[PDB]
Subunit: 509 residues, 3 copies
Amino acid sequence: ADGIQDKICIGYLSNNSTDTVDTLTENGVPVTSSIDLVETNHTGTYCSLNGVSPIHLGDCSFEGWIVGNPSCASNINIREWSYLIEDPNAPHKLCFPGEVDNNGELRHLFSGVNSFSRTELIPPSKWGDILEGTTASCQNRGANSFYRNLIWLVNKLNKYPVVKGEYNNTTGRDVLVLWGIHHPDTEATANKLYVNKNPYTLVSTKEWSRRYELEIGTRIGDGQRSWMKIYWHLMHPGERITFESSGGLLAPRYGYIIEKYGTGRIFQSGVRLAKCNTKCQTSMGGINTNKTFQNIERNALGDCPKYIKSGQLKLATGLRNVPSIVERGLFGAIAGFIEGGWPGLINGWYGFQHQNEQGTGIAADKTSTQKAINEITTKINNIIEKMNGNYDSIRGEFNQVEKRINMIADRVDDAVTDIWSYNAKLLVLIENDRTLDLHDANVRNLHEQIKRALKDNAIDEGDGCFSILHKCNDSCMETIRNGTYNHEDYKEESQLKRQEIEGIRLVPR
Amino acid sequence: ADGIQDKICIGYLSNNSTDTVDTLTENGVPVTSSIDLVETNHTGTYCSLNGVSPIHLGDCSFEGWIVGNPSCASNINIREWSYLIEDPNAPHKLCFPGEVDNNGELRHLFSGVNSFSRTELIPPSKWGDILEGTTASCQNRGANSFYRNLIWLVNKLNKYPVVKGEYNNTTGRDVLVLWGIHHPDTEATANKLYVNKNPYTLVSTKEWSRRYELEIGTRIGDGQRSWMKIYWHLMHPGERITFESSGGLLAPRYGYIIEKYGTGRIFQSGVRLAKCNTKCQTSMGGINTNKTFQNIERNALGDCPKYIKSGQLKLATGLRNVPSIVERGLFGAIAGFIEGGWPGLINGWYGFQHQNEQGTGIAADKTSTQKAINEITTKINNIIEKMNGNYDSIRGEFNQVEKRINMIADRVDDAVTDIWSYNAKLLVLIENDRTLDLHDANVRNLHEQIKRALKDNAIDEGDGCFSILHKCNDSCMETIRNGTYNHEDYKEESQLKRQEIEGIRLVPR
Amino acid sequence: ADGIQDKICIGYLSNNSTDTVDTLTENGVPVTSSIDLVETNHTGTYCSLNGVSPIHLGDCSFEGWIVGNPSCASNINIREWSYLIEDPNAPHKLCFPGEVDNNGELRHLFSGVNSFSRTELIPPSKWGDILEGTTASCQNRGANSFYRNLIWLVNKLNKYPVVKGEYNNTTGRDVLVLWGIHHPDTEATANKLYVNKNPYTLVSTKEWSRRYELEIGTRIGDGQRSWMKIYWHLMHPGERITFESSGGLLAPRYGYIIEKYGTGRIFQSGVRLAKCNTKCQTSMGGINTNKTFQNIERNALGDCPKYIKSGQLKLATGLRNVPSIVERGLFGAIAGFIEGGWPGLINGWYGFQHQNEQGTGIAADKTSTQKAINEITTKINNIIEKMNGNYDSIRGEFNQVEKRINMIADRVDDAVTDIWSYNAKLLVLIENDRTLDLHDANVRNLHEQIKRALKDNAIDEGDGCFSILHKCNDSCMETIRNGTYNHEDYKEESQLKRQEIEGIRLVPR
Ligand SMILES: *[C@@H]1O[C@H](CO)[C@@H](O[C@@H]2O[C@H](CO)[C@@H](O)[C@H](O)[C@H]2NC(C)=O)[C@H](O)[C@H]1NC(C)=O
Ligand SMILES: *[C@@H]1O[C@H](CO)[C@@H](O[C@@H]2O[C@H](CO)[C@@H](O)[C@H](O)[C@H]2NC(C)=O)[C@H](O)[C@H]1NC(C)=O
Ligand SMILES: *[C@@H]1O[C@H](CO)[C@@H](O[C@@H]2O[C@H](CO)[C@@H](O)[C@H](O)[C@H]2NC(C)=O)[C@H](O)[C@H]1NC(C)=O
Ligand SMILES: *[C@@H]1O[C@H](CO)[C@@H](O)[C@H](O)[C@H]1NC(C)=O
Ligand SMILES: *[C@@H]1O[C@H](CO)[C@@H](O)[C@H](O)[C@H]1NC(C)=O
Ligand SMILES: *[C@@H]1O[C@H](CO)[C@@H](O)[C@H](O)[C@H]1NC(C)=O
């Protein structure tokens, strides 16, 4: 074949790429590397959350558990929980027919509590010459009993003196106090249990006072015609609460001393509780990741990636080194192998390819490729580390009659997810174009430094290569790659060669 | 005239620019085309919403309609609605002076409902040896009557036996049950209507229980001194509800089986209900658009563009082809005509203008321009189609005494709008710079490919044009345009011409 | 030193930088100037808010103030407030033991009130033949007294006739109406004060009706064993309210006409009230800035920068004029002085540096720099001026029992702040890359312009400079700078010089 000038090319060195990204302007762009911004894996189980175990309520509802239905696990030894797991259809709810007042708010406050201790508020003896009602509805191991937290005060010897009890919160923390009223199905039952005419109960702190009378009538709860209503109050430190009754009162025995609460979630049973720990629990499973987005489950609690409605989002890190870059004046070469291999993050080289009489080869330019790795590392770290806010669900606990406020809370969570989801999808598409164009600008900048060093000693072939107008052996090549080439040294030889080339004619003149 | 070299210019072809955009860095930039991102057109009427008609409550309030004020249109035949339209001063509210308990919640749940069916819960005969009170306050076809949904139980022959009724929700769906209590103005009226001393009403499900006694005294509603309180509960499947009364109960007759509810809005009357269908209904009119933003009305319901506080936002799609582009080394030509017309999205071509002895002309480069159309299309489709979230108002239904929560919910809607408003205004400005810059970059790329083809056979005039150093007739120009021109074919002629040009002296040596 | 050709260099003229910023891809980039996007300075005091004074409740709680505890300053003369400052341990609350119903809602609506006036609802005479109860718990002006806004109706001559009174809202505005019920500690006290058996109060509008009976028993408030409960209603124009009692009513005397309410905040005492005015009040102090973000305090009210969780964010405006730009083909010079000084926005100039046999000098290119100032100004103004939404806290007032809605509101506030926080941090990083890159493109364009004018009469040195192939005295330099230089003028000279330099040999041939 005809003789050819020695040649040096500046551009990309990499292997063949398989994995593509999308950019705002282009689809299915092959690049040498990328990262996934979205977490899709999870444990598929309920785990501890940041070292703190949840409580699985098993066969019991929250209400049954918190009031102390003796068919439920006692909470005498509980110290903390991160979240609760509850069976919507748990069999053991309130053992004796009744309801809990404001129980959506109570669920929300006990969804997680970081410091919890059950405490005896008032000893059973304080109420005086009374006895304690028990019921087959609320059995303890086959014996008739009652909620662990309350005392059903009833007549002794057919008398019911006025009873009184009080509790001062001296614990230095918040204390949950529970009490109730039993409403008889008949006047006969009321007369029998409580004796006194027009029984009343009066409960007060220095901030509020409530008075309760009996609401007589037949109800349709299972296993009883009468009915109980349960009430609660969270006392701040220094509060005082007093109870007085001539009949009806289900007296407070045990309360809960609680600190750092409302910090959990009531998740639904089904998914299994496993021995494991995660920094982000969702209803599908626990997530352990350094990714800042997840597309698994909107219902999430803890140190979480933001949920987004998205498929995977691949953030380009490497090079667009495909055959067609030549149409933009860029050079690239493909090679299964180099030496010291390819850099991890960008997979991985700006560099040179040469040809002279001694042969061919490729060589990386470490200094420029390092500035690129730094720029890419800086970009990725800024996108990731600046997302340092709070991204678990915006969510509350609500009961059956709180549909409006439940709906609006869930909508605001959805609206916040919509802003994040669009922003994430666009940032990635935009930044992918900017990263690919950044690699191009970098190699073009290297190409211009070479152009500048070669001056009139080389023809710019417009494809990222230079044809050198003198003999350029491996030592010459290495002076070009290492920035020490001096065009003066070869001026005589180069002007003679340029003259010779200028005179060649494809069709004879 | 003096001799001139044949010439080819690479750049923009288009007609005159009638369309200006703003960019992050410049105002009033003329471009050959853009698209509007914000919808400003609407029907000015209330329409069907994605195939589902609303209900115009006409001269009735929601309360009147829902309890069945006989002056209001029966809902016996209604099966569904997308939203409600209500006159805030409708004359027909509760016909007999009264109130509906928790009516904000009730409004919110009935704002729209996908499957609705009225149902007779309990036959009027079940209540026993009672009669039914009617009233001139509630006339039906001129006759004294009562709400369709309730039965005013009163004595028969100066007897009022205890009445009982119950309803088992066996429907597989949610059942709204309504009931009330009448509170006499005097003990005399209470004795006359209900007979029994201290009459009571007891209503209960297995989940809750309420007991109601009469609250006697004169009220100020129009046409009556007495007063009614209406109450409701939404039963889930399997629930059971019982009624018992010795006087005062306004007994349940008709309830409503409902599925997929709380999905609507209660819009205010004034704007007219037209025969039409839209995917997004606002209080101003229906919006039928593929735009993703609207600036018409914040109160919007359905598959909606997100409401933003903004003027129109023009996204540039076409070319910055103005005379001043030459200051940045770019060529452009303005033509009222080109064979085959201009492309739709960019309203302009990348391409060529030429001059030689045969004459002058312009020609589109189809390959480059097509690549641009793909890029702009992909860009637009991303910006638009990635916004597939839920952008109608974050809003609820609240009554007069629910001001705080209403205020808060509205502020959240507004803050969400403030996020999207800024994001939209800025994205457009930013993306317009990118788009106009991308077009430049694309024609600079063409110009460079030609530069590379012509090599030393053309002088780069720095204005987008090359002065060709040989005769280049139409055939030769087509080889340049179609990428087959071979500089070697004209090497002798081009060298001779260059030598001649270098020898010329404007001012004689 | 050897003879050198005359030279002109195109690029940046400025002083040493001393100012750094970060970009998405690089940290600590020295720039000639930047601006701070985040406000960090505040008054450290409570000020008037946009000309409207707050109210410092001093040693009274809001309840105590609004009901008119005589220990609290009278609000007879108040016309408005922008916000309230309250001691959470204020000693003067309700002077007689009691509670205010729905007091969190009340706090929220009175948090700031733009038009307020106290008004006499019902003259004391209306209630008929009763006397006014007073108490040492509520002393005023040396004597037992009672709340300013209420009258404790008690018997006269051991009779308590049924009292009645009404108020019609004909103010055209909303009117806050307060009433109460006294609950005796004993039957003996009830029979003594009110005489009648089973005393009742009936309070009704045309929209609702409430009946209150006495709740007898001993409470634990300081200084009294009985208890009062206080109620309110906000009447819209046209509303009518009626009161009737046979014992217990604390009758309404003064109410409040209000307009544009719910607009404030209840800040906590501590920070002192000062004679100042600002547009944005935070719990840390007043903020008077045109910046659109602040990192001072999340609890902020008014015309506010958005609170973000961020350090300072420095937006690049000036030039990246550092020695290493020459590696990217760019020229810059550093100088202390230039005729007329540096432009303030970018600090300072695109321009020229020359050298010939008359000496060396720099000169600004005013036309290209002004374009850059316009571009940056336009950028800044878009970023700032398009943030014209509402950015103070998403917040409400709640009482102690309203923990869940308070937590959820505060969470929404936080999640909105999290969006703006990430967005502001990224946007500054991204725009800084784009600003410095824009300045680079601008000077490269000026350089290309000069390149085009010099044509073959100059050697492009690839560092921003041109070696001119002829003598170019200062007049010649000036024709280059002002775009009148004509290469034809120096063609003969330049070709002779080029041919000379081509023949020179560093090592003799
Ligand atoms: C709860 O606290 C109160 C104080 O608020 C206690 O009542 C005081 O009891 C002391 C004697 O221990 C008396 O000297 C005071 O006169 C009482 N003060 C008041 C204001 O009533 C009460 O004993 C404490 N209750 C419990 C269960 O410990
Ligand atoms: C509502 O459901 C209850 C419970 O299924 C029905 O009461 C049952 O009625 C049958 C027929 O008389 C008796 O044999 C059962 O013993 C009853 N069960 C209970 C638990 O009482 C009741 O009839 C249903 N009511 C209506 C109106 O459908
Ligand atoms: C409040 O308004 C009511 C309703 O307008 C007034 O009651 C009317 O008083 C007029 C004038 O004396 C009578 O002729 C009407 O018959 C009344 N109508 C009704 C329905 O009551 C009442 O006087 C007003 N109250 C006050 C204190 O101004
Ligand atoms: C550059 O390469 C030449 C040839 O290998 C070598 O002799 C010289 O030391 C190198 N200079 C630098 C700075 O590495
Ligand atoms: C390009 O134009 C030349 C000159 O007219 C023509 O003969 C040739 O076939 C064309 N080639 C292509 C690839 O269109
Ligand atoms: C440019 O420079 C020349 C020489 O200094 C001067 O005479 C002339 O007026 C200038 N031209 C313009 C257009 O400013």
